[PDB]
Amino acid sequence: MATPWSGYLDDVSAKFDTGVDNLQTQVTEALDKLAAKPSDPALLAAYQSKLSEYNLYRNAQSNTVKVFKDIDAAILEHHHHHH
């Protein structure tokens, strides 16, 4: 039982804003290098990698969203397990 997510959105969705930041901190530290010796391709390509990994954090934040569904499918099996 819960209250509707639209009344609590800036806590429920806002969970993303600190998990994204574990990716952002990472891209920004690749950028801490790219601000140091910029187009050095060994660091700049790690930046441009992390820049994509952060969009993969975003992709994972469209998988988790469909995995809470899988816990709920385990809840679905728990209703059958009442037999």
From Swiss-Prot:
Result, substituting residue 26 to E: Has wild-type invasiveness
Effect of residue 67 to A: Shows a specific deficiency in the secretion of the translocase SipB/SctE. Shows fully assembled needle complexes. Is able to invade cultured epithelial cells
Domain of life according to the entry: Bacteria
Effect of residue 11 to A: Exhibits constitutive secretion of substrates. Retains the ability to display SipD/SctA at the tip of the needle filament
Recorded consequence of changing residue 70 to K: Can secrete only early substrates. Can assemble needle filaments in vitro, but shows a filament assembly defect in vivo. Can invade cultured epithelial cells
Cysteines engaged in disulfide bonds, as pairs: none
Phenotype for residue 66 to E: Can secrete only early substrates. Can assemble needle filaments in vitro, but shows a filament assembly defect in vivo. Can invade cultured epithelial cells
Result when mutating residue 26 to A: Non-invasive phenotype
Record GO biological process: protein secretion by the type III secretion system
GO CC, alphabetical: cell surface; extracellular region; type III protein secretion system complex
Resulting phenotype, residue 63 to A: Exhibits constitutive secretion of substrates. Retains the ability to display SipD/SctA at the tip of the needle filament
A single GO molecular function term of this UniProt record: identical protein binding
Subcellular location: Secreted; Cell surface
The entry's keywords: Protein transport, Secreted, Transport, Virulence
Record annotation: effect of changing residue 58 to A: Exhibits constitutive secretion of substrates. Retains the ability to display SipD/SctA at the tip of the needle filament
Gene induction: Negatively regulated by PhoP-PhoQ.
Outcome (variant: residue 55 to A): Exhibits constitutive secretion of substrates. Retains the ability to display SipD/SctA at the tip of the needle filament
Effect recorded for residue 65 to A: Can only secrete early substrates such as InvJ/ScpT, PrgJ/SctI and PrgI/SctF. Does not yield assembled filaments in vitro. Cannot enter cultured epithelial cells
Principal cellular location given in the protein's record: secreted
UniProt-reported outcome of changing residue 9 to A: Can only secrete early substrates such as InvJ/ScpT, PrgJ/SctI and PrgI/SctF. Can polymerize into filaments in vitro, but not in vivo. Cannot enter cultured epithelial cells
NCBIfam families, alphabetized: III_needle, PRK15326.1
Subunit structure: The core secretion machinery of the T3SS is composed of approximately 20 different proteins, including cytoplasmic components, a base, an export apparatus and a needle. This subunit polymerizes and forms the helical needle filament. Interacts with the needle tip protein SipD/SctA. Interacts with the needle adapter protein PrgJ/SctI, the secretin InvG/SctC and the minor export apparatus protein SpaP/SctR. In vitro, the needle protomer refolds spontaneously to extend the needle from the distal end.
Function description: Component of the type III secretion system (T3SS), also called injectisome, which is used to inject bacterial effector proteins into eukaryotic host cells. PrgI/SctF1 forms the external needle filament that protrudes from the bacterial surface. Is probably involved in the transduction of an activating signal, thought to be mediated by the distal tip of the needle filament, to the secretion machine. Required for invasion of epithelial cells. Required for the secretion of the effector protein SptP.
Record family assignment: Belongs to the SctF family.
Miscellaneous information on this protein: The levels of PrgI/SctF are reduced in an invA/sctV mutant, probably due to protein instability, and are increased in an invJ/sctP mutant.
Protein name: SPI-1 type 3 secretion system needle filament protein
Gene: sctF1
